[PDB]
């Protein structure tokens, strides 16, 4: 492939410099249409920002934490971190979001990676071996009420059981409704006056319950959880302009109040190099 | 070779090798040809 | 029992490794795809499409005058504007190629630079635009400006001019995230001749300018972008 | 003869003539068409008025003055009361519609100013309290009076500003979306052929909107000496190749 | 011995996965099976034989009389009955479909609908079903019913009428969960001329209600059903 | 006009059975052609035929 | 590939793909036409 062709002199009628942008199109104007030039070759295919490369590596996407501990006279053990959920995002850490929000529509299979690691903040003789169990809770599902429900039964949910220090990973077929996920949504769930705006289910992931399978030892022990996130077999529509203010909502694209201004000004004039 | 039964299981895609940037850079109605008079 | 041995690296977690992995949701049947208008395939093919450049980044908050390259009328001689080309920082950092650029490590190809006139229809100017390579430094006035890559733009009917920044390098890669060794010139802007304004007519013209990768445009080594950060997780 | 310059559009039973056009846009290089079975979910027949939906529909004027920040409507809102388009719109289910947009502004060879006229598709718009805070029904579907960019922020309306497109994203960059410029100096019209842009193959025109059209000055408005300082701009929509299917008895909507 | 890697996700079990297994009873020879009528191979077989709905709900306890849809002689324009379409909540919820539904996220598909007529034999009556789609509310009037999908019956000699809610939607699956978005519509039902009694005779007549799934449902993405629970395991 | 002058009218034809426009948005959905004043100074508008019976009377 | 000797220890069974409602549905002795009259 050549990069450049060799191109000489010209003194034409036939300019191809002059050009109309009111018009919409980027003429594809090159080097050689305005100076002279010599052969070169690519020697480059534009592989690695190919759609798929670019949303294939594996990102953070949640970061949870649940504790195993005596649960006598625990009345709520949701809120002692018995047990945690997550419903399934990719927009609450920003690093993914961003790169995501670049197209409009998005469609492709998710694998995740799970890792859990232990901490013990306050003396333990030991460190003990603790499993984890992630359920994957589709909606309309019955939702764990205590760290041992009947539900975490799940007879017909997929449920995955990997130790702590480990790392667990399976892959989620594109679970949408539609065809593609939205990444923005100009719309309502009905017409209603006060309904949420922006935040649709056309999104909807799925979402997720973590608990240790162990009961009690004397010590108390921390686990954090970190979902990771691998775009597979990716397929993107209608780019976008891309994110300039900072984030402040899961779902929404509002920006905070008095932002700093995003564009860096000059230290000297329009003149200055 | 594949391990698994479902499609989600498989590794990622392979280059799409498409690539046409005129549905983004020239999406004009009437066809424009550089080197001729952008309005005629 | 097969005998096998465990390499270095076992169980370890890459997050750009590519492997197979058992689903979740055995025998489970996506949604048929419709079809959707504009699907892009490579951030090549977007960074093609141009996008304004905030030029004059001399205001103290965003506004949309610092998408104005303000021209004077009767000046001669003298200069319109100048910018060093790290097309990773400064006013090109927030235009979609200084946005997608940042994506990644290297950057190689042409740029195309390109000046909208918006001044009434009955006035005229002579601009010449110049491309300092590497190695000198930003010319200080038209004359030094005139010995490098240049273009003197004649102000007409066809209203845009697309200046080229030819690839003019050593080393065939540059640094996205300015860098000395790698860095890749000046380019400025001058009165040709000048701009002159009908009878019933004044003040100040301005140009809007571009800034769009020639098909020529390598980029490579992915990385994480210092364009977006954050301090807690978000929630709904 | 023919000139990218002088176009006529006949639509229905209205036509529109330009003299100094500028080429015209066609969203994503696609030209709108009706929904294809192998594309169909719904199992209703759909009802396609044909031209007595699909002609030109002219919006009120704006005023385009020095201060002026800009103007958006959404689509299909702004034409929810025109016609027949927007009876067959409360009344059925879902529908479904491409548009051919026409925006004008004509000036004289001594003025000089310069729209930007752009589609987005899918415009989420932002609350300008920050937070989560929602943006109201009612304040995203203006109608044909679309939003006037240089109003005041109001409670449970949209943010804006617009060196941030009412989103988080900077003014430069929207010329990634299709657009054409009307630059008082080239041009004095703008027409972009929009087709339907969905991740589902049919929706509801009312709880959805799936473009907004913006028109935007972005060189400021000069008029010559003691001329009147400010031109009118006018907008003229038509839908195109439009469809309902899921008929019944008509929404009721907010507000 | 060959060299290997272990990748994440090693030593994990996942419920939903499919491999081999060491048989614990190596060269055992199970039972020849014999033929017996009614094998099942599909959910979907099963779900479209009709199932009668409690439409009647209005009772305090479980009783046989919320089968029943109560109808009153010389009634005129007035109301029968009406339901919004949440198939896997409220009536619909302790059907078979609905009992089904519910090991399920998402359905699609046509419903099929009907009314047996029960009352004496020399009695007539003219009834109008409406089906109404998303976007407009439960029909508060004949008028306002008879303009979506609608059916008159005549009470006859054949005394059934099956009604189909046509797959009305943008959106190709919806939620079995009760959700806006998604949302399906409502039912209604009402006198298009009015029920009449033979002499000697009186009171209420009743029709009685069936729901089946057309052959059209699609039914996907299994999970747990809120439908049965427990609080200690069960002992012999 | 002078040349250097410009225009953008609207000329709309109301077919029987509603009354005269009385504001363009009235005017604008019936027969109506957006003229732009230009180098080419005529606008031919038709008044197509529209009617019920195939003839009316001149008086 | 089985590498196991005995039927239990395979993976999970493949889809019946069979399909026949009418045992369930329509188990009536003489057929019934969709059109033709239900009692004659």
């Not at chain 1, 859990?116 to 939702?143: E, F, K, R």
């Amino acid at each position: 492939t050549v990069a450049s062709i060799s191109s000489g002199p010209k003194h034409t009628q036939k300019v191809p410099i002059l050009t109309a942008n009111e018009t919409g199109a980027t003429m594809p104007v090159l080097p050689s249409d305005s100076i002279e030039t010599r052969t070169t070759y690519m020697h480059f295919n534009g592989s690695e920002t190919d759609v798929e490369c670019f949303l294939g590596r594996a990102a953070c996407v949640h970061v949870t934490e649940i504790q195993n501990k005596d649960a006598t006279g625990i009345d709520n053990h949701r809120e002692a971190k018995l047990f945690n959920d997550w419903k399934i995002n990719l927009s609450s850490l920003v690093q993914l979001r961003k790169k995501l929000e670049l197209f409009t529509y998005v469609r492709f299979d998710s694998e995740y990676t799970i890792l859990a690691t232990a901490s013990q903040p306050d003396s333990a003789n030991y460190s003990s071996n603790l499993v984890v169990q992630a359920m994957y809770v589709p909606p309309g599902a019955p939702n764990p009420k205590e760290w041992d429900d009947y539900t975490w039964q799940s007879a017909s949910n997929p449920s995955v059981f990997f130790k702590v220090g480990d790392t667990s990973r399976f892959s989620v077929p594109y679970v949408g409704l539609a065809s593609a996920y939205n990444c923005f949504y100009d719309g309502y769930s009905h017409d209603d006056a006060e309904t949420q705006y922006g935040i649709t289910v056309l999104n909807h992931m799925g979402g997720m319950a973590f608990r240790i399978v162990n009961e009690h030892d004397e010590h108390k022990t921390l686990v954090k959880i970190r979902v990771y996130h691998r775009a597979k077999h990716v397929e993107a529509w209608i780019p976008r302009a891309p994110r300039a203010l900072p984030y402040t909502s899961i779902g929404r694209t509002n920006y905070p109040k008095n932002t700093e201004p995003v564009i860096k000004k000059r230290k000297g004039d329009i003149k200055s190099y | 070779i594949n391990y698994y039964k479902d499609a989600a299981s498989t590794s990622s895609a392979g280059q799409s090798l498409s690539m046409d940037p005129s549905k983004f850079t020239e999406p004009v109605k009437d066809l424009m040809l550089k080197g001729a008079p952008a309005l005629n | 029992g097969l005998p096998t041995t465990t390499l270095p690296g076992s169980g370890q977690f890459l997050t750009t490794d590519d492997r197979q992995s058992p689903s979740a949701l055995p025998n489970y049947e996506p949604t048929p795809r419709i079809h959707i208008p504009g699907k892009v395939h490579n951030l090549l093919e977007i960074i093609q499409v141009d996008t304004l450049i905030p030029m004059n980044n001399t205001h103290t908050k965003d506004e949309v005058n610092s998408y104005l390259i303000p021209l004077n009328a009767n000046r001669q001689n003298e200069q319109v504007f100048g910018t060093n080309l790290f097309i990773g920082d400064g006013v090109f950092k927030t235009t979609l190629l200084g946005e997608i650029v940042q994506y990644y490590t290297h950057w190689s190809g042409s740029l195309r630079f390109s000046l909208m006139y918006t001044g009434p229809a009955l006035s005229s100017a002579k601009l010449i635009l110049a491309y300092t390579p590497p190695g000198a430094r930003g010319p200080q006035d038209r004359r030094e400006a005139m010995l490098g890559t240049h273009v003197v733009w004649d102000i007409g009917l066809q209203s845009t001019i697309v200046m080229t920044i030819p690839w003019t390098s050593g080393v065939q890669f540059r640094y996205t995230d300015p860098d000395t060794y790698t860095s890749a010139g000046f380019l400025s802007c001058w009165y040709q001749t000048s701009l002159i304004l009908p009878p019933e007519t004044t003040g100040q013209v301005y140009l809007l300018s571009f800034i769009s990768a020639c098909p020529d445009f390598k980029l490579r080594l992915m990385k994480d972008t210092q364009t977006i950060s954050q301090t807690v997780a978000l929630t709904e | 003869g023919y000139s990218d310059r002088v176009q006529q559009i006949t639509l229905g039973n209205s036509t529109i003539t330009t003299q100094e056009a500028a080429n015209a846009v066609v969203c994503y290089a696609e030209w709108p068409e009706y929904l294809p079975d192998v594309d169909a979910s719904d199992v209703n027949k759909t009802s396609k008025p044909d031209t007595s939906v699909c002609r030109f529909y002219t919006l009120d004027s704006k005023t385009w003055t020095t201060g002026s920040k800009g103007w958006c409507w959404k689509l299909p809102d702004a034409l929810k009361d025109m016609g027949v388009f927007g009876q067959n719109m409360f009344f059925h289910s879902l529908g479904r519609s491409g548009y051919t947009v026409h925006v004008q502004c004509n000036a004289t060879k001594f003025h000089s100013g310069c729209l930007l006229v752009v589609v987005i598709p899918e415009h989420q718009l932002a609350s300008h309290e920050g937070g989560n805070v929602s943006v109201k029904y009612t304040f995203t579907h203006p109608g044909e009076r679309g939003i006037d960019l240089s109003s005041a922020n109001e409670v449970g309306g949209p943010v804006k500003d617009v060196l941030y497109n009412m989103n988080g994203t900077l003014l430069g960059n929207l010329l990634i979306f299709p657009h054409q410029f009307i630059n008082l100096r080239t041009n004095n019209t703008a027409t972009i052929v929009i087709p339907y842009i969905n991740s589902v193959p049919i929706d509801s025109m009312t709880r959805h909107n799936n473009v907004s059209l913006m028109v935007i000055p972005i060189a400021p408005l000069t008029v010559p000496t003691g001329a009147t300082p400010s031109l009118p701009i006018t907008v003229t929509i038509a839908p195109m190749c439009t469809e309902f299917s899921g008929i019944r008895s008509k929404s009721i909507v907010p507000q």
